[PDB]
Amino acid sequence: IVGGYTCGANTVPYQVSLNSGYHFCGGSLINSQWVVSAAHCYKSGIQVRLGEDNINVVEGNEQFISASKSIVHPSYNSNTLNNDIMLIKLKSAASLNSRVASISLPTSCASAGTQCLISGWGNTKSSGTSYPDVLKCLKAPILSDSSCKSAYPGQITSNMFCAGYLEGGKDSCQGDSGGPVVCSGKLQGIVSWGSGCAQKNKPGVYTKVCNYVSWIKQTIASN
Ligand SMILES: [Ca+2]
Numbered sequence: 326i327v328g329g330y331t332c333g334a335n336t337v338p339y340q341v342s343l344n345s346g347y348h349f350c351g352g353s354l355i356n357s358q359w360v361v362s363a364a365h366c367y368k369s370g371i372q373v374r375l376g377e378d379n380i381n382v383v384e385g386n387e388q389f390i391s392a393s394k395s396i397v398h399p400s401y402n403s404n405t406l407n408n409d410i411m412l413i414k415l416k417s418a419a420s421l422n423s424r425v426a427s428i429s430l431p432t433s434c435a436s437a438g439t440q441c442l443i444s445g446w447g448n449t450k451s452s453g454t455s456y457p458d459v460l461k462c463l464k465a466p467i468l469s470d471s472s473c474k475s476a477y478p479g480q481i482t483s484n485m486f487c488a489g490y491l492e493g494g495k496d497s498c499q500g501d502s503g504g505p506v507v508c509s510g511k512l513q514g515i516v517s518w519g520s521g522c523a524q525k526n527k528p529g530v531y532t533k534v535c536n537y538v539s540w541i542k543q544t545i546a547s548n
Contacts, residue, residue, distance in 0.1 A: 351504025
């Protein structure tokens with residue numbers, strides 16, 4: 326997250342870190358045994374880390390649970406990033422509490438202008454590299470479809486939305502991928518892509534979660 330703020334420990338209780346020996350992507354806990362992330366975060370050997378603030382210090386609220394299964398969206402296209410969503414099942418259910426909690430799936434899609442919370446452990450610099458130990462947060466509005474398409478000609482599908490600031494300076498970034506965009510208490514987006522980070526006229530692009538609720542629910546119901 327570039328241009329954000331320190332969230333505060335366990336203030337984003339649905340945020341998870343995906344770990345394969347190190348943090349490599351975010352995700353969102355959607356019930357006690359399932360996480361939503363980005364398909365481009367797929368790999369084998371995932372351990373889901375819940376209850377994290379500092380990802381380099383055991384602070385006492387963590388739960389570390391291996392994945393038993395990954396399910397990349399049927400129609401994921403890694404060239405275009407269309408359908409950039411996957412589900413991860415935990416080998417055991419997380420113990421839900423105030424600090425480790427699921428986030429609601431949307432009933433309805435969110436509109437441009439709605440203010441959302443984007444979070445992660447990704448790079449905090451738009452030039453160069455600095456990766457934080459503690460969770461970072463950014464409040465950002467959803468942008469109109471028109472302005473998203475104008476920023477990224479030939480690239481925005483019906484399964485994507487833009488959020489952030491056209492002036493630059495405030496965005497998600499590498500290492501935030503797969504993490505949440507939460508608006509009025511519902512998971513509306515997944516950190517997906519963007520040209521650089523926090524560049525003028527290059528807002529963040531996010532997977533449009535409301536399009537996937539039926540797939541998520543029926544996948545959970547049979548897996
Ligand atoms: Ca920790």
